[PDB]
Amino acid sequence: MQDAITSVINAADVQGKYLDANSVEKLRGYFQTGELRVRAAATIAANAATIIKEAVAKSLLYSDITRPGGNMYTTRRYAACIRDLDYYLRYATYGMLAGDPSILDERVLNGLKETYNSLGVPIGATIQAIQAMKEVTGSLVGSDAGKEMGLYFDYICSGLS
Amino acid sequence: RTAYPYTGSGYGSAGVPYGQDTYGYKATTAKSITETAAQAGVFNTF
Amino acid sequence: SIVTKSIVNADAEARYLSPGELDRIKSFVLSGQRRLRIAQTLTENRERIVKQGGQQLFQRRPDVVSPGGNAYGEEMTATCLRDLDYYLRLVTYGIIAGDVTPIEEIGLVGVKEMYSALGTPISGVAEGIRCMKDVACSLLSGEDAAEVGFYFDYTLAAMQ
Amino acid sequence: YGFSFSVLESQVKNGQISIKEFVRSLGKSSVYQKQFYQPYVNSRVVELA
Amino acid sequence: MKSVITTVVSAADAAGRFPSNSDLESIQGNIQRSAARLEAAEKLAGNHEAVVKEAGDACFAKYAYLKNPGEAGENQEKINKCYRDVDHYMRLVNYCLVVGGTGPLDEWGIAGAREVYRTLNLPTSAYVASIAYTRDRLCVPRDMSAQAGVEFSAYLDYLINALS
Amino acid sequence: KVVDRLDSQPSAAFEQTKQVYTFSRYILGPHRAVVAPVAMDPSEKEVVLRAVYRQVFGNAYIMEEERAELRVMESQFLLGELSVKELVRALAKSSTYKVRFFEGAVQYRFIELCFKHLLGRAPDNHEEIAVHMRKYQQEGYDAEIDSYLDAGEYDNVFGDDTVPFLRFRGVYTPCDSFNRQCALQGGWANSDKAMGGAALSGYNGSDGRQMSTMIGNYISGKPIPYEKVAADTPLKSTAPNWYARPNPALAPQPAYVSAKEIAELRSRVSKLEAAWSVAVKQSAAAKDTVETWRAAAKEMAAMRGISPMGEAYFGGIAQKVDNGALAQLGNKASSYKKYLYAIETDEVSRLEVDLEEAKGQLRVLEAAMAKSTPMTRTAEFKTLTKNVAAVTAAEKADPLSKRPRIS
Amino acid sequence: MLDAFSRVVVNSDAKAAYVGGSDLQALKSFIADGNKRLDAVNSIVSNASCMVSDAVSGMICENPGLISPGGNCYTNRRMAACLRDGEIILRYVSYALLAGDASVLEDRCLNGLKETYIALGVPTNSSIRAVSIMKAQAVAFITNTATERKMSFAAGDCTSLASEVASYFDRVGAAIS
Amino acid sequence: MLDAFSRVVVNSDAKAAYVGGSDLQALKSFIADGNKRLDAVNSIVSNASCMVSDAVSGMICENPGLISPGGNCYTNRRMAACLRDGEIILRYVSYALLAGDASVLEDRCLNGLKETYIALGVPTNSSIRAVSIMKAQAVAFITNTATERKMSFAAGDCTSLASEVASYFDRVGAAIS
Amino acid sequence: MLDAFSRVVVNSDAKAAYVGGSDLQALKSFIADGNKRLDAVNSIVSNASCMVSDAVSGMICENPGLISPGGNCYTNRRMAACLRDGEIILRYVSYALLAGDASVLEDRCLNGLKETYIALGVPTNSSIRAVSIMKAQAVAFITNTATERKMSFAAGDCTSLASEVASYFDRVGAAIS
Numbered sequence A: 001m002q003d004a005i006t007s008v009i010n011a012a013d014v015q016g017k018y019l020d021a022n023s024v025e026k027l028r029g030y031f032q033t034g035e036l037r038v039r040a041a042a043t044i045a046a047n048a049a050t051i052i053k054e055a056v057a058k059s060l061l062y063s064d065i066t067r068p069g070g071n072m073y074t075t076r077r078y079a080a081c082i083r084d085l086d087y088y089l090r091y092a093t094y095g096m097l098a099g100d101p102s103i104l105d106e107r108v109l110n111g112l113k114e115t116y117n118s119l120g121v122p123i124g125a126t127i128q129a130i131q132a133m134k135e136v137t138g139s140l141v142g143s144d145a146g147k148e149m150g151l152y153f154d155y156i157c158s159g160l161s
Numbered sequence B: 001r002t003a004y005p006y007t008g009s010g011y012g013s014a015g016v017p018y019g020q021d022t023y024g025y026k027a028t029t030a031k032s033i034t035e036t037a038a039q040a041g042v043f044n045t046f
Numbered sequence C: 001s002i003v004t005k006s007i008v009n010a011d012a013e014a015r016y017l018s019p020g021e022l023d024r025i026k027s028f029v030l031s032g033q034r035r036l037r038i039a040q041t042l043t044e045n046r047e048r049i050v051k052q053g054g055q056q057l058f059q060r061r062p063d064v065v066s067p068g069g070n071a072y073g074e075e076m077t078a079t080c081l082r083d084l085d086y087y088l089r090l091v092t093y094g095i096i097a098g099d100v101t102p103i104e105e106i107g108l109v110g111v112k113e114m115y116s117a118l119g120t121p122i123s124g125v126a127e128g129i130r131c132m133k134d135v136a137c138s139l140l141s142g143e144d145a146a147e148v149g150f151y152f153d154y155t156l157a158a159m160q
Numbered sequence D: 001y002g003f004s005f006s007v008l009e010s011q012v013k014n015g016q017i018s019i020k021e022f023v024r025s026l027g028k029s030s031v032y033q034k035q036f037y038q039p040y041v042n043s044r045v046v047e048l049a
Numbered sequence E: 001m002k003s004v005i006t007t008v009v010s011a012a013d014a015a016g017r018f019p020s021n022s023d024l025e026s027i028q029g030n031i032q033r034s035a036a037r038l039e040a041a042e043k044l045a046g047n048h049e050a051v052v053k054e055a056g057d058a059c060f061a062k063y064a065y066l067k068n069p070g071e072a073g074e075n076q077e078k079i080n081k082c083y084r085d086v087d088h089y090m091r092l093v094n095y096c097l098v099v100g101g102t103g104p105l106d107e108w109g110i111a112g113a114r115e116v117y118r119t120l121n122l123p124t125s126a127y128v129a130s131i132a133y134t135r136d137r138l139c140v141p142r143d144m145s146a147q148a149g150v151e152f153s154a155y156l157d158y159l160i161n162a163l164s
Numbered sequence F: 001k002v003v004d005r006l007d008s009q010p011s012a013a014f015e016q017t018k019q020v021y022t023f024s025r026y027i028l029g030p031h032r033a034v035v036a037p038v039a040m041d042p043s044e045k046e047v048v049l050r051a052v053y054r055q056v057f058g059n060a061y062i063m064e065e066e067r068a069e070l071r072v073m074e075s076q077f078l079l080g081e082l083s084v085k086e087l088v089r090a091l092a093k094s095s096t097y098k099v100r101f102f103e104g105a106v107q108y109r110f111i112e113l114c115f116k117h118l119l120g121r122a123p124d125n126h127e128e129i130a131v132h133m134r135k136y137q138q139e140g141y142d143a144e145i146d147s148y149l150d151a152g153e154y155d156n157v158f159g160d161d162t163v164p165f166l167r168f169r170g171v172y173t174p175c176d177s178f179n180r181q182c183a184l185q186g187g188w189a190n191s192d193k194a195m196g197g198a199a200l201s202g203y204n205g206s207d208g209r210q211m212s213t214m215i216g217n218y219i220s221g222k223p224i225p226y227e228k229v230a231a232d233t234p235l236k237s238t239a240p241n242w243y244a245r246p247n248p249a250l251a252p253q254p255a256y257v258s259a260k261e262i263a264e265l266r267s268r269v270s271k272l273e274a275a276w277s278v279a280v281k282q283s284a285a286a287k288d289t290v291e292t293w294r295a296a297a298k299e300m301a302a303m304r305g306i307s308p309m310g311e312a313y314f315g316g317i318a319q320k321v322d323n324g325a326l327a328q329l330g331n332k333a334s335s336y337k338k339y340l341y342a343i344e345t346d347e348v349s350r351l352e353v354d355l356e357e358a359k360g361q362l363r364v365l366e367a368a369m370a371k372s373t374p375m376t377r378t379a380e381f382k383t384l385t386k387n388v389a390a391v392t393a394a395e396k397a398d399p400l401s402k403r404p405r406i407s
Numbered sequence G, H, I: 001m002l003d004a005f006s007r008v009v010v011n012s013d014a015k016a017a018y019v020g021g022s023d024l025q026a027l028k029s030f031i032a033d034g035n036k037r038l039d040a041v042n043s044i045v046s047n048a049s050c051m052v053s054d055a056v057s058g059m060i061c062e063n064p065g066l067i068s069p070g071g072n073c074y075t076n077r078r079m080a081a082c083l084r085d086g087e088i089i090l091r092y093v094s095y096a097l098l099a100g101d102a103s104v105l106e107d108r109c110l111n112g113l114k115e116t117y118i119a120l121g122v123p124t125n126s127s128i129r130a131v132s133i134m135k136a137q138a139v140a141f142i143t144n145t146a147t148e149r150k151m152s153f154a155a156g157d158c159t160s161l162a163s164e165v166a167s168y169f170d171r172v173g174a175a176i177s
């Protein structure tokens, strides 16, 4: 659980040296985007339910995982999805603010693909849902902010694959 | 009857136990790095 | 069913089943002949129980089908009746299981999360099941209508 | 009150953590300490624990 | 992918030469023109579901006969596929603005389209009623910039010139 | 009639490219026509000369230092009194075409090289070669090539204006004619000095035998195995670079294949194949739960239609209309986009992706068990108790030989 | 390639026999219903440009992942390519029905289609679904039980040629599996 | 073949997405240092006739059995080909540095080079050293730390293009190993 | 290669500087003549590209039935595999020369080679000719008595390394006989 400042301090500390010009050079780069990330995390908090409603209706709403036999049939199983998609849109918001994807594999990625295989959850449909959820997130926060929030979505999709 | 069945019990279940073997959180069975390689018999100089 | 949760009740308590539990598994299986007849009535009346079910639902809730309603158009109205076919099916399971345990973990647990997340008015779908209940109990005698209606109103209670 | 620990019901229903883990995380929650920790004394908190 | 890179490294590779100053100069044009053509790749991406919705019904408002039985848009599933195809042609135009040339259109949408639209009996004039409605719904300094409306339209009526 | 006419008939009047070359792999990669213009710049004469040296020599190092007999045959072409057909005939009569592909070549290797160099294709059947064998042995090699390029094949598909190219012609008159094509023109790297093995048999890379593979495929009807048509392959060079969900490119062959990995993989691809045949009979009618009420929810919802914009006022509020073709059926943007997300979310497609993914993992794992006696194994799995026995004593399958010594 | 007359000639040339009267009872019966074979293969060729679009798109409605991006029938090149081998197979089966012998199918259409479709990444189970829809249509048009088009025919039985064109379609199913 | 613009297209096609605001910051940063990339290709192709003789002759002074008789650089025709594939590889790496993606490296240079060099009998481990001297030269020219020719530049960081051209030579050195 | 001499670990956090519980006494003792051994393997592997091509062509020009068609080295796959296997054998003697013992050679290279060469029809009487050339080649190079190539070593003696490496080549040569 490290942000961009924590990761910069760790690497500069792990060699026992002070924060030289290169370490502060990245820190200044993070502070420049500090204004963009909060507004990105602002609108995502507002439209959390709307984004997840848009992703599932755009990716896996009418596919036969939704029908009987599919992986999402019963109401408990459907309700687990939007609960499950809420974490991906939420933890990706944390990575967008912290500027470092360490929180994702610390709290989301580890034991995740090993868990879906146990339950039999389709990893293929899961990643598009996140891909479609990444597509709507670029709608709200804009282009570059979508590039930032989108940079952690595919990090989840990569490791979850 | 759908092929990709699932796990769980009670109603809304496909006749397959949770986790495919009744274990939700499975204890791993792999060894670490250097003696997974020691068992392979090919990474001997490594 | 009554058999599975009378077991898991006495299972948790580290004991066997009392006469109160075993004189009802006994009383339920002798009731099993009459249950299949009741579920057999609703099984091949789904054409009328659903279509007349959505009959009163739109007359009582024209908003949901009017332009802007969730079930607007040829598409959503078909799915508008699809859910009623689901819940009518689960009531046939509850009648044969002698309990809402099939209806509990299917169509009831977390149902408000689904319909809130679909934009559907959950009160509207509750009105749909009530309209199906009057059609269902109109198809059976008084001794049966105290059961078939009995499972609908439980679904009405959990759906709000 | 419509409270929710979806993460904890996740990690316990899958068996990722024990009931004892789910109980301990409930104790260190903030909906707990707002309920049975803030309005009381450390003396009374020990007995209510 | 017919692009500005893959003409100067396809003609140099057939010639067997290193990328000389004639080919580094061509990608200097990929820095000035791409400031505008990615803006039309970004506005089209953030508003794609409303553009195809405003464009795909002009296929059926102009040709109302498609909902007759026996014709192409006769039921529910065939109408949803007709809106799907205009979403495809609006997606490759978003792919062509971000490539730099007509690469994703000449390989993925155009090539073989005259053999599937004749075999499946789709009217290809109904497709260009939807694309030419999108070209004339384009307000040039309101939708995007002045230059990004040039780049977005020049792939649109190229696609019209392909289908007709 | 999807394709009106093949490439062997000439392009009639009204096209710049033939109909089969539009939607084949002609348009993707560098196997196109580079037909000479009428009058041209000597740089543009060098462009059409460099494609001839790539095509008719087959990526051979022509060693531009010498170009010994070449510059008379070049200067007949740079004037314009030699056609591109007559240049590519004259290059196939020289000594530097003979010392590469004739002085060490078998008459199967030579005929299969003239089909790749002069024409585009591979040899199709057996008696197509047996014409060109008997035409060489009675008339000689100078009257072979003259009787080889002046049939009805070259003058229609290239004419006397364009250079030859690899003819991705779409309609292949045996199906193996695509297989031997991509096995001969072996990718963008391999030349025919390499492919026939003329360098490795050569005494210091000179005067070696141009032996041939695929001689067993021209005698008997036998297809090319798939590794020669998918790995060292021009389809990798004119690759579409798609997202192909069964990826056609073969994996490199793994070291340390085990029989325990294959024997569960063959049971897995029999598990999916038996489950695909069940699920495909239930498709498109019984898998759609909303289909059964479409006959009624389509006539329940045909009440109080609104012709302009504005009504369904509903007690005096706005609540208007959309009145398009889509939203009169109530559909949304998530209703036509549900077809693009039908790989994870489908069920029949869920089986056919992992069927062809695991068969493609099977066909390179089973074909890596062509190495038996000194091969060092390993145990990457945790040496579990699952083990098939070695019970192979008596007959278990026994393919039916009803004529055991029938005489 | 051969036909139905020249199939029994190479059968009789394996024992160097003349073509006698005991052999020729099949071939004299072959021209006795030779009107029916042209009356059969006319019904396939008059509906052949809609037989492919009934079948390749009938594969789509059974397996709708092929039109999703990734599935092998997605791009307009790929759909025009899959329609192209929809009518190559229908051309050679109608050739094989006309000659009455399966030799022209197996040395020109199917010889190496299996190794070709492995190399392009074409799924081999879905191509059986394209063939079996064309199997059910060619036995429908020949017996005139097509449920939206009847053609004019003289009265009589035809199910031998419906069986022969059925056996020319499962050769396509057995070649590429 | 692809470039760095159309690699994220066919990645965004595999997801059936539009190229929205998340992916364009990857590409607008790619054209932000687009002047830096063309200043890196120009350091390669200006010394490219001298780098190929620098690298093939460095292979000879390490493994001198190539110019030994019976070797693979003994015959003078066989030497002139080894100077040619030193620079055809440098032609295709410089296209891959120009395009920003190694598709044209994978699909044209390395498309069958491994079974070429087996079937010509070329020693593969010396083809690694012919490639990898050009890796150690191009990361010296792009960082402008070549020890006998410095080129003029506007100053700044360039180490991403150094590791990008070192990633394209491994992709060559692993595909022919 | 790198297990052939044990090294010392001096830094902490290792588990072998402190709880090593041993030092490798059999391989320290081989740096007591380690520079002379390392010059000998450098004398082989700087000529290993030329020693395998001379020896394989040595048995070709003495037994010319192998490059005859029908022989076991006529086709290009077999001729590339024969040059590969002499290169692999010359590497594994150069492991066993470097490590100072033949225990690497007999299980990774010789265990199951005589059963392999009779399972492929490889002439065992000709392959032992191919290693006796490399037996005679390696003792010329280690003693620096090669006719066309010398190397600038230090002043000393390298017999009983030449007879050590000649004792490995017949140990190969009887394991396939």
Ligand SMILES: *C(=C)C1=C(C)[C@@H](Cc2[nH]c(/C=C3N=C(/C=C4\NC(=O)[C@H](C)[C@H]4CC)C(C)=C\3CCC(=O)O)c(CCC(=O)O)c2C)NC1=O
Binding pocket: H065, H068, H069, H070, H071, I047, I050, I051, I054, I055, I057, I058, I059, I061, I062, I132, I133, I136, I137, I140, I141, I145, I146, I147, I148, I149
């Ligand atoms: C054909 C019939 C035929 C040959 C081909 C040739 C092969 C051959 N060579 C030897 C002996 C040696 N070969 C050596 C190898 C090389 N010498 C070099 O300088 C270069 C680097 C390298 C070749 C590329 C060496 C060093 C020797 C030892 C003699 C010497 O000091 O040069 C043999 C074996 C002879 C024997 O065992 O006595 C053969 C077969 N000779 C041919 O006859």
Ligand SMILES: *[C@H](C)[C@H]1/C(=C/C2=NC(=C\c3[nH]c(C[C@H]4NC(=O)C(C=C)=C4C)c(C)c3CCC(=O)O)/C(CCC(=O)O)=C2C)NC(=O)[C@@H]1C
Binding pocket: E059, E066, E072, E073, E074, E078, E079, E081, E082, E083, E085, E086, E088, E089, E108, E109, E116, E120, E122, E123, E126, E127, G057, G060, G067, G074, G075, G076, G079
């Ligand atoms: C819409 C305004 C038209 C119309 C469209 C229909 N198209 C049908 C099928 C179809 N369309 C395409 C081309 C499209 N798919 C792609 O993947 C791409 C880009 C890569 C494009 C442009 C294809 C390839 C197909 C066949 C496969 C499929 O998608 O089903 C279609 C169904 C035909 C049928 O079922 O018979 C329709 C109805 N038709 C209309 O009504 C208006 C004119």
Ligand SMILES: *[C@H](C)[C@H]1/C(=C/C2=NC(=C\c3[nH]c(C[C@H]4NC(=O)C(C=C)=C4C)c(C)c3CCC(=O)O)/C(CCC(=O)O)=C2C)NC(=O)[C@@H]1C
Binding pocket: F024, F025, F168, F169, F170, F171, F172, F173, F174, F175, F178, F240, G056, G066, G071, G072, G073, G077, G078, G079, G081, G082, G083, G084, G085, G086, G088, G089, G108, G109, G113, G116, G120, G122, G123, G126, G127, G130
């Ligand atoms: C369609 C129902 C399939 C499908 C087919 C694809 N085939 C593609 C190329 C292709 N098809 C054939 C078969 C056919 N052509 C012939 O010439 C002959 C016999 C002489 C036959 C039976 C061949 C040989 C080829 C290769 C030719 C070429 O592509 O140039 C193809 C294109 C792949 C691509 O462009 O890379 C497709 C998509 N795909 C499907 O999903 C269904 C099952």
Ligand SMILES: *[C@H](C)[C@H]1/C(=C/C2=NC(=C\c3[nH]c(C[C@H]4NC(=O)C(C=C)=C4C)c(C)c3CCC(=O)O)/C(CCC(=O)O)=C2C)NC(=O)[C@@H]1C
Binding pocket: G032, G033, G034, G035, G036, G038, G039, G040, G042, G142, G143, G144, G153, G154, G155, G156, G157, G158, G161
């Ligand atoms: C079976 C698939 C059909 C069917 C077939 C029958 N056809 C009969 C007679 C018939 N058909 C033709 C036309 C045919 N001969 C040609 O030379 C050409 C094209 C140039 C064609 C299309 C002829 C000439 C005849 C003979 C009688 C006449 O002159 O009309 C037939 C009657 C018995 C027979 O003559 O073989 C049958 C049973 N009829 C069916 O019921 C199914 C659907």
Ligand SMILES: *[C@H](C)[C@H]1/C(=C/C2=NC(=C\c3[nH]c(C[C@H]4NC(=O)C(C=C)=C4C)c(C)c3CCC(=O)O)/C(CCC(=O)O)=C2C)NC(=O)[C@@H]1C
Binding pocket: F059, F060, F061, F188, F189, F190, F191, F192, F193, F194, F198, F199, F202, F205, F206, H056, H066, H072, H073, H077, H078, H079, H081, H082, H083, H084, H085, H086, H088, H089, H108, H109, H113, H116, H120, H122, H123, H126, H127, H130
């Ligand atoms: C030199 C650094 C090597 C070496 C090279 C040799 N290559 C010989 C022929 C040859 N070289 C290539 C490589 C190159 N040409 C291409 O067209 C492409 C890809 C587009 C590449 C990478 C090829 C394909 C060929 C075969 C061409 C032909 O000869 O027809 C060669 C001469 C063999 C001969 O003349 O018989 C040599 C010596 N060998 C070495 O030892 C170093 C490591």
Ligand SMILES: *[C@H](C)[C@H]1/C(=C/C2=NC(=C\c3[nH]c(C[C@H]4NC(=O)C(C=C)=C4C)c(C)c3CCC(=O)O)/C(CCC(=O)O)=C2C)NC(=O)[C@@H]1C
Binding pocket: E021, E024, E025, E026, E027, E028, H032, H033, H034, H035, H036, H038, H039, H040, H042, H142, H143, H144, H153, H154, H155, H156, H157, H158, H161
């Ligand atoms: C890193 C590999 C180098 C280095 C690179 C930098 N180059 C910078 C600017 C720059 N280079 C060029 C010329 C280039 N652009 C073209 O269009 C063509 C050919 C057609 C070429 C050769 C230009 C035009 C510029 C922009 C400034 C100018 O007007 O000259 C640069 C400055 C930052 C930037 O502009 O991106 C850097 C850091 N410099 C180094 O120190 C290493 C060695």
Ligand SMILES: *[C@H](C)[C@H]1/C(=C/C2=NC(=C\c3[nH]c(C[C@H]4NC(=O)C(C=C)=C4C)c(C)c3CCC(=O)O)/C(CCC(=O)O)=C2C)NC(=O)[C@@H]1C
Binding pocket: F371, F374, F375, I056, I066, I072, I073, I077, I078, I079, I081, I082, I083, I085, I086, I088, I089, I108, I109, I113, I116, I120, I122, I123, I126, I127, I130
């Ligand atoms: C050339 C000097 C010989 C000769 C060689 C051939 N060997 C062939 C195949 C082969 N060789 C080996 C042993 C080799 N591989 C190893 O991994 C090791 C040690 C670590 C050694 C020594 C094996 C295991 C194989 C089979 C698998 C493979 O292909 O590598 C071979 C091919 C046989 C064929 O294709 O018919 C040849 C020609 N044969 C000769 O005639 C001369 C004497």
Ligand SMILES: C=CC1=C(C)[C@@H](Cc2[nH]c(/C=C3N=C(/C=C4\NC(=O)[C@H](C)[C@H]4CC)C(C)=C\3CCC(=O)O)c(CCC(=O)O)c2C)NC1=O
Binding pocket: E043, E044, E045, E047, E050, E051, E054, E134, E137, E138, E139, E140, E142, E143
């Ligand atoms: C990425 C591409 C892209 C575009 C090209 C536009 C295209 C576009 N404009 C409008 C919508 C509109 N467009 C205009 C603009 C004009 N109307 C005219 O008749 C004049 C020609 C012009 C003045 C400049 C106006 C005034 C509206 C709102 C009312 C209307 O629909 O006309 C709509 C309907 C949805 C909406 O309300 O926005 C669409 C798709 N939007 C996009 O996202």
Ligand SMILES: C=CC1=C(C)[C@@H](Cc2[nH]c(/C=C3N=C(/C=C4\NC(=O)[C@H](C)[C@H]4CC)C(C)=C\3CCC(=O)O)c(CCC(=O)O)c2C)NC1=O
Binding pocket: F284, G047, G050, G051, G053, G054, G055, G057, G058, G060, G061, G062, G133, G136, G137, G140, G141, G145, G146, G147, G148, G149
């Ligand atoms: C998912 C979408 C979908 C389709 C496209 C069809 C495709 C289709 N058609 C038929 C079955 C058939 N298909 C045709 C084909 C045609 N009829 C004609 O008259 C024309 C020549 C041609 C259309 C242009 C014929 C003639 C039959 C035989 C029965 C009949 O229609 O009379 C079958 C096998 C039996 C069946 O399931 O019905 C299938 C799968 N079915 C589907 O479920």
Ligand SMILES: C=CC1=C(C)[C@@H](Cc2[nH]c(/C=C3N=C(/C=C4\NC(=O)[C@H](C)[C@H]4CC)C(C)=C\3CCC(=O)O)c(CCC(=O)O)c2C)NC1=O
Binding pocket: H047, H050, H051, H053, H054, H055, H057, H058, H059, H060, H061, H062, H133, H136, H137, H140, H141, H145, H146, H147, H148, H149
């Ligand atoms: C036994 C023979 C033998 C050689 C000939 C040299 C060859 C050589 N040079 C370099 C290393 C290099 N080689 C060059 C090449 C050149 N320098 C230039 O300015 C020109 C463009 C080009 C000569 C025409 C460059 C630029 C470097 C990087 C460092 C530098 O020289 O500035 C390397 C890689 C690093 C290394 O392994 O040491 C090698 C093998 N070394 C040898 O061992």
Ligand SMILES: CCC1=C(C)/C(=C/C2=NC(=C\c3[nH]c(/C=C4\NC(=O)[C@H](C)[C@H]4CC)c(C)c3CCC(=O)O)/C(CCC(=O)O)=C2C)NC1=O
Binding pocket: A057, A061, A062, A066, A067, A073, A074, A075, A078, C064, C065, C069, C070, C071, C072, C076, C077, C079, C080, C081, C083, C084, C086, C087, C106, C107, C108, C118, C120, C121, C124, C125, C128
């Ligand atoms: C067995 C328990 C169970 C239920 C109940 C269930 C419901 C369910 N209802 C859905 C949609 C829907 N449901 C409605 C329903 C209604 N509109 C109205 O106006 C009415 C108030 C109401 C019906 C009486 C509509 C309009 C949609 C489509 C919404 C959309 O397209 O956005 C969907 C998504 C499409 C689908 O896969 O069917 C599911 C999964 N699934 C289950 O497993």
Ligand SMILES: CCC1=C(C)/C(=C/C2=NC(=C\c3[nH]c(/C=C4\NC(=O)[C@H](C)[C@H]4CC)c(C)c3CCC(=O)O)/C(CCC(=O)O)=C2C)NC1=O
Binding pocket: A065, A071, A072, A076, A077, A078, A080, A081, A082, A084, A085, A087, A107, A108, A109, A112, A115, A119, A121, A122, A123, A125, A126, A129, B006, B007, B008, D007, D009, D010, D011, D013, D014, D016
């Ligand atoms: C914070 C990191 C984190 C994640 C992500 C997580 C996931 C997680 N997902 C679960 C279930 C589930 N997840 C799904 C999800 C899906 N079905 C589909 O078809 C789609 C592809 C997908 C929605 C995108 C379903 C249906 C279940 C219920 C499975 C069952 O009842 O068997 C469960 C079982 C317990 C429960 O939900 O209470 C866990 C623990 N836990 C974590 O700690």
